[PDB]
């Protein structure tokens, strides 16, 4: 249970997403940006893709070079 | 992919035929069930495996529905 020592993980990750909404972000970037944002190393060591995709309005996919990319879904109106 | 050699082929097929409208995990599992005649090997972290398949996209919807697709 890593939610005990890092309870705000949800809003912190959504925050990084929101900051990267335009172009999307990789995993290693999510981590470095998490460190920059909170002063603490990204706590999640297992199943990060699953964690990312537990968050609504998120899409993921790979570039041709094999980078797994996450981004917010465009709004529909 | 290791123990199950043809898993790649089978999941690629389930995608090709049944994912045209997007496909959830459990749909992949029941489709695999109706395909190979046996329960889908993976339980946890299927999203990771799916994403390792070329030309596949994942999405968590506004309402929290996890759906997989082929790009175009």
Curated annotation (Swiss-Prot), chain A:
Tissue spec: Begins to accumulate at the posterior pole of the oocyte from stage 8 onwards.
The HTH OST-type domain is annotated at 5-74
Compartments annotated for it: namely: Endosome
Query: Subunit arrangement?
Result: Interacts with smaug (smg).
Role this protein plays = Organizes the germ plasm and directs localization of the posterior determinant nanos. Oskar protein is required to keep nanos (nos) RNA and staufen protein at the posterior pole.
Look up the further comments and give them.
Answer: Capu, spir, and stau are required for the initial localization of osk to the posterior pole.
Q: What's the protein name?
A: Maternal effect protein oskar
User: What range of the parent protein does this fragment cover?
Assistant: 150 to 224 of 606
């Amino acid at each position: 249970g890593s939610r005990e020592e890092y309870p705000d993980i949800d809003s912190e990750v959504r925050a990084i997403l929101l900051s990267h909404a335009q172009n999307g972000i990789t995993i290693s970037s999510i981590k470095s940006e998490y460190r920059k944002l909170t002063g603490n190393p990204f706590p999640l060591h297992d199943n990060v893709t699953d964690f990312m995709l537990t968050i609504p309005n998120v899409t993921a996919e790979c570039s041709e070079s094999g980078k797994r990319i996450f981004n917010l879904k465009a709004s529909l109106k």
